[PDB]
Structure formats: C-alpha cells, structure tokens
Amino acid sequence: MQVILLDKIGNLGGLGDTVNVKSGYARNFLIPQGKAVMAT
RNA sequence: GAAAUCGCUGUGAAGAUGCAGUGUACCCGCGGCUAGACGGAAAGACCCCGUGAACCUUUACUACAGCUUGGCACUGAACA
Numbered sequence: 719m720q721v722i723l724l725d726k727i728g729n730l731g732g733l734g735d736t737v738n739v740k741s742g743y744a745r746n747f748l749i750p751q752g753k754a755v756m757a758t
Numbered sequence: 759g760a761a762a763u764c765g766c767u768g769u770g771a772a773g774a775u776g777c778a779g780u781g782u783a784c785c786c787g788c789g790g791c792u793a794g795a796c797g798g799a800a801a802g803a804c805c806c807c808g809u810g811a812a813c814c815u816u817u818a819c820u821a822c823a824g825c826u827u828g829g830c831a832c833u834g835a836a837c838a
Contacts, residue, residue: 728835
C-alpha cells in the first residue's frame with residue numbers, strides 16, 4: 719500500500735515522502751494515528 | 759370347483775372315494791373317536807435361486823465428516 723508520510727518515521731522516510739508499506743502497517747497504525755495517509 | 763363323497767389289490771405326475779379288476783354295501787339321523795381326506799390355518803421361516811433388500815463387520819472399493827499438516831489471507835513494527 720502506497721502511503722504519504724504526514725511525519726518523519728524511523729525507517730520509512732520523512733514528511734511528505736511516498737513509500738510502499740504493508741497494508742497492516744498502514745491500516746492498523748500509520749493511518750489511524752495520523753502518521754501517514756493513503757497515497758490516492 | 760362340483761359331488762350320487764365304500765374296502766382291497768393293482769394302475770397312475772410314481773402313497774386313489776372318483777382309474778381297472780374285484781369285494782362289500784337298504785335310505786336317513788343322534789352320541790362318541792380322530793386313521794385318511796397328502797384335513798384347516800399362514801403364496802416354507804429350512805434349502806436354492808434373483809446380476810433381489812436390509813442391517814452389521816473389516817487391514818474390500820470409493821467417498822465424506824471429524825481430526826490434523828503446511829501455504830495464502832485476516833497479519834503489523836523494530837532490531838539480532
């Protein structure tokens with residue numbers, strides 16, 4: 719799942735950086751807590 | 759099934775009231791008996807057969823449930 723980082727993450731990347739993540743990571747952590755968003 | 763429904767010896771789908779030969783025998787009840795009518799009853803349970811049935815068994819066949827194995831999904835993050 720491609721996601722836009724709304725903040726800096728340890729390994730993923732920096733704010734505004736697009737990265738593929740596992741859908742669990744996005745669904746269950748990054749997106750719910752506002753650390754990223756769906757890269758529509 | 760219908761009967762005017764005797765014995766014997768023989769005959770005969772092979773154990774005869776009913777055929778042959780023969781012997782006996784007036785017609786009809788009632789009380790008794792059960793030898794025969796292969797008496798009545800139940801389309802033999804025995805036995806065989808049907809490419810019949812059922813239920814039961816198992817290391818018969820083929821399946822399935824259940825149980826179990828791994829892959830994938832739901833399922834992510836850091837390090838080593």
